[PDB]
Symmetry: C5
Subunit: 101 residues, 5 copies
């Protein structure tokens, strides 16, 4: 089954934690109307193939250059934290929460 | 699997498009492909959002794209499949914005 | 399925391209829209015209491009059922549309 | 996914405008899946256009434009896996290059 | 199949990332998702290349992306799968450049 997913990362609330008791498929990352005209970096933190915790950079966005990046359905296994690493925000992430059996 | 074209135009006097379907004996999905700015759009940031129910039963609004005529007038979503009901809305910016995709049955 | 190249050129003088077939099932999968070297520095809008799920003919905007801002857009395999018209709603062109014609 | 995938790339430039992709009668179905087109560091600031030349479904050779790129506007376009059955020629239709094309050679 | 997060950072200090898998019996792929420029990247073209095997078993270098902070800071590759082993390399520019993606395992 396939549900809408989204989160907002901002100075207030730099992180979103995807957990639960499934797959997230990330679709776009985009800067809100009010973001400072500067580079924003959004990162994902989770476990790699070795079982080590890593931080990976998903996108670098700037309002006057590239305010949206489309990820094409980047599937991630829970758990993952999405975080605004730099830039004012707000930054949005959209995608799907997929459930199977 | 039938595949039909899908589109809508979001503009100042019509900021929403309601994808709802019903009394079908048939499963419906939309797969969004592009969001694009029309010619007369003000050169300012435009934001299009989707409003629908999440995995935990709560209506949410998610941002699909931020576009700007002089910077990035089209964004490709690559087949963002959404289950009905869903509202697409022009959250901010003037000028008309378009969404294109597919309506699968 | 098998896979063959698809393309067309749209410009102010040749604004429309009609995609039709007979036969096998056919689908057109669009991949890129791009602006040609000689296109004017202005917005070019490309649209598709074909049927919606209720049988009514609609027109949908595939892409807005401009040589000095975004000369190409990748559609990522936008599958369309024949027949469809592709049209240059605005802009000088030339604009190119590329993709696959899939046959099964 | 499924069958085997190998890396594919070529470079196109003013003095080397074409790359011809052909597969020998070996056994298997072969696909060339195009992933990216990007401009090299040295490329002049002008539009560069890359086209592909191959078979339509009527068996006739056609030329289609894959991407228009410019260093100071849009130096890379991801094609997301535009599969093409060999043979096909990739050509720098306009501009100086260098241009690179990347992708996968798929074998089943 | 399995899907794990993958990432690496390439910069003038460390221009290469080597993706190998310890021989096992299963199919691994590195599926590349995005390449993006870090906060301190200088404003010049950055070019990331991959070096790996072609269909004839010969090692080739192929350019994946060209990025520049004031024109195009991020490129999505949309799941460009490559069979190990592969080196990813900053073929020019300063970096930092980051690559994200998935390490896929099947069979």
């Amino acid at each position: 089954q396939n549900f809408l997913f989204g989160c907002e990362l901002k100075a207030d609330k730099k992180e979103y934690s995807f957990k639960v008791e499934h797959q997230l498929s990330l679709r776009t990352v985009s800067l809100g109307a009010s973001a400072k005209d500067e580079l924003h970096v959004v990162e994902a933190e989770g476990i790699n193939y070795e079982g080590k915790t890593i931080k990976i950079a998903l996108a670098s966005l700037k309002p006057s250059v590239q305010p949206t990046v489309s990820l094409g359905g980047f599937e991630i296994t829970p758990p993952v934290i999405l975080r605004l690493k730099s830039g004012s925000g707000p930054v949005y992430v959209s995608g799907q929460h997929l459930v199977a059996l």
